[PDB]
């Protein structure tokens, strides 16, 4: 559903704003645009300068996995570049990751408001770049060192800028790939540079490239779960996220977007459970074995993820507004159980999480059932903690 995904969008006040910059034709512009965004503490502006859609549609699964062997699979965004089905999950997780880069640099550089651009230098590593460009399936990767000043302080930053189809964007606000861990936002310089140019910090926006889902609900808790699974079956993953979107907002909200990122991760995790890949590791795998794992993430069979029954869990921890339910499934003829925690809004019910603590089911956990076990469960009208 192109229509079904469209009408579950919160076109926030910032998302309604016009973008007067088509593109960044030079990596320097893209860097400055991002620097201005940070200066103005403008999240919306910042997001538009990141390579959210381009990375999501182009990233090379195999190469990227080889670069990040200690990553486990559920910690990386869904493989949208291989299977467009995953797009809303990948966009949403990436968007969260970028918000966190933004927030971190905004924290780790005191008085980022008073920022002055002293120099932007192109780091000298052709080996490192070609390699990252291959990971990203990018035309060019350019690793830049950025020297800025805040008060008496001078700091160095490292951005990874990327080019696709002759247009630049920031892939990462910290050195290397967006998904690398334990990278510092900045380092403070002992000595202070004289500024090289008159750097022009822009303030137009460039194109919108993120979404905030609106809340949607159903009149019973079971029906919320049913339509959530129907969305998954039909590839309406944005609507799937909308079912757990507990608040709207007038403007673009970092908090709501990060939550959306988290739920996307839980959803992904659930799908990986049915695919048999939730516990997959990327280390010590040949290019061939990585390709097999790639093939195993194909979501084309999600159309045969069927709910057999949505069954209430009886527990102490249920309240008049929060209830735990078990989902009983056939995924292409194999039976699974998962857990839901649902919350009652004014209109009706939404998904709070893909967990049911009352049956020890963690967020996104999927439990395989024998045919015997599945039939016994289907006969229950209630599961007692």
Query: Which of 105, 119, 169, 117 minimizes the C-alpha distance to 141?
Result: 169
Question: Rounded to whole angstroms, how far apart are CA atoms 267 and 13?
Answer: 27
Q: Taking a C-beta distance cutoff of 8 angstroms, is the pair 363, 353 a contact?
A: yes
Three-state secondary structure call for residue 362: coil
Residues in binding site for Mg(2+):
360
Question: Rounded to whole angstroms, how far apart are CA atoms 175 and 182?
Answer: 11
Query: Which of 123, 113, 140, 106 minimizes the C-alpha distance to 201?
Result: 113
Domain ranges of the chain: 1-211, 212-385
40 phi, psi to nearest 5 deg = -90, 10
Give the CB-side neighbour count of residue 176, counting CA atoms within 13 A: 10
Quick one: resolution in A?
2.1
Q: Taking a C-beta distance cutoff of 8 angstroms, is the pair 270, 237 a contact?
A: no
Helix axes 254-275, 87-108, angle to 10 degrees: 140
Torsion angle, alpha carbons of 358, 362, 366, 370, to 10: -40
Question: Rounded to whole angstroms, how far apart are CA atoms 274 and 268?
Answer: 10
Residue with tokens 């797009």: 87
The Cα-based distances of 66 to 52, 55, 63, 285, 298 in angstroms read: 21, 17, 5, 8, 20
Backbone φ/ψ region at 257: left (φ over 0), alpha (ψ -120 to 50), beta: alpha
Beta-bridged to residue 322, according to DSSP, are 343
Experimental method: X-ray
Three-state secondary structure call for residue 383: strand
Beta-bridged to residue 158, according to DSSP, are 145
Q: Taking a C-beta distance cutoff of 8 angstroms, is the pair 262, 246 a contact?
A: no
Residues in binding site:
360
251 phi, psi to nearest 5 deg = -105, 170
Residue with tokens 């159903």: 218
The Cα-based distances of 224 to 10, 228, 370 in angstroms read: 20, 6, 26
Beta-bridged to residue 171, according to DSSP, are none
Query: Which of 328, 324, 349 minimizes the C-alpha distance to 337?
Result: 328
CA 299 to chain centre: 18
Contacts of residue 376, defined as CB under 8 A and 6 or more positions apart, other chains included, come to none
Helix axes 27-39, 87-108, angle to 10 degrees: 70
Q: Taking a C-beta distance cutoff of 8 angstroms, is the pair 359, 326 a contact?
A: yes
C-alpha angle 76/367/269, rounded to 5°? Answer: 15
Contacts of residue 286, defined as CB under 8 A and 6 or more positions apart, other chains included, come to none
Question: Rounded to whole angstroms, how far apart are CA atoms 282 and 43?
Answer: 33
CA 374 to chain centre: 33
Structure tokens at 343: 């919350």
Beta-bridged to residue 294, according to DSSP, are none
Contacts of residue 146, defined as CB under 8 A and 6 or more positions apart, other chains included, come to 31, 35, 117, 119, 120, 121, 156, 157, 158, 159
Check residue 323 and report its DSSP letter.
E
Beta strands per DSSP E along 296-385? 305-314, 322-331, 334-344, 349-353, 367-369, 383-384
Strand pairing report for 349-353 and 334-344:
antiparallel
Check residue 219 and report its DSSP letter.
S
């Amino acid at each position: 559903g192109k229509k079904e995904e469209s009408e579950v969008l919160n076109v926030t006040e910032s998302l309604q704003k016009e973008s007067e910059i088509t593109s960044f034709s030079e990596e320097e512009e893209a860097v400055l645009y991002m620097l201005s965004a940070l200066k103005k503490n403008d999240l919306d502006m910042a997001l538009r300068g990141c390579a959210i859609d381009e990375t999501a549609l182009q990233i090379n699964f195999v190469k990227t996995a080889e670069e990040l062997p200690g990553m486990q699979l559920i910690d990386l965004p869904a493989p949208t570049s291989d299977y467009s089905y995953y797009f809303p999950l990948t966009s949403a997780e990436m968007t969260k990751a970028y918000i966190e880069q933004f927030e971190e640099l905004s924290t780790e550089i005191p008085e980022i408001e008073t920022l002055e651009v002293l120099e932007i230098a192109e780091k000298k590593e052709k080996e490192r770049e070609e390699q990252l460009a291959e990971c990203l399936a990018a035309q060019e990767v350019s690793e830049l060192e950025i020297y800025v000043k805040c008060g008496e302080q001078s700091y160095r930053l490292g951005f990874t800028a990327v080019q696709y189809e002759k247009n630049w964007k920031i892939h990462s606000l910290k050195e290397g790939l967006l998904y690398e861990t334990d990278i510092p936002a900045c380092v403070q310089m002992e000595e202070m540079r004289e500024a090289k140019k008159t750097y022009v910090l822009p303030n137009q926006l460039t194109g919108a490239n993120y979404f905030q889902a609106m809340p949607i609900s159903e009149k019973t808790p079971q029906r919320a779960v049913e339509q959530f699974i129907y969305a998954i079956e039909k590839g309406d993953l944005t609507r799937a996220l909308a079912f757990a979107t507990t608040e709207s907002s007038q403007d673009t909200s970092p908090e709501l977007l990060k939550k959306q990122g988290e739920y996307a991760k839980e959803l992904k995790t659930m799908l990986y459970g049915f695919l048999g890949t939730e516990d997959a590791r990327l280390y010590g795998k040949s290019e061939e074995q990585l390709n097999k794992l790639r093939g195993k993430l194909n979501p084309e069979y999600m159309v045969y993820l069927d709910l057999i029954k949505v069954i209430p869990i009886e527990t102490e921890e249920n309240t008049e507004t929060v209830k735990q339910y078990a989902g009983l499934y056939s995924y292409n003829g194999k039976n699974y159980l998962t857990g839901y925690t649902l919350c009652r809004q004014e209109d009706g019910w939404q998904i709070q999480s893909l967990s049911a603590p009352a049956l020890s089911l963690e967020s996104g956990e999927v439990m395989r059932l024998s045919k015997e076990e599945s039939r016994k469960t289907s006969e229950q009208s209630v599961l007692k903690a």
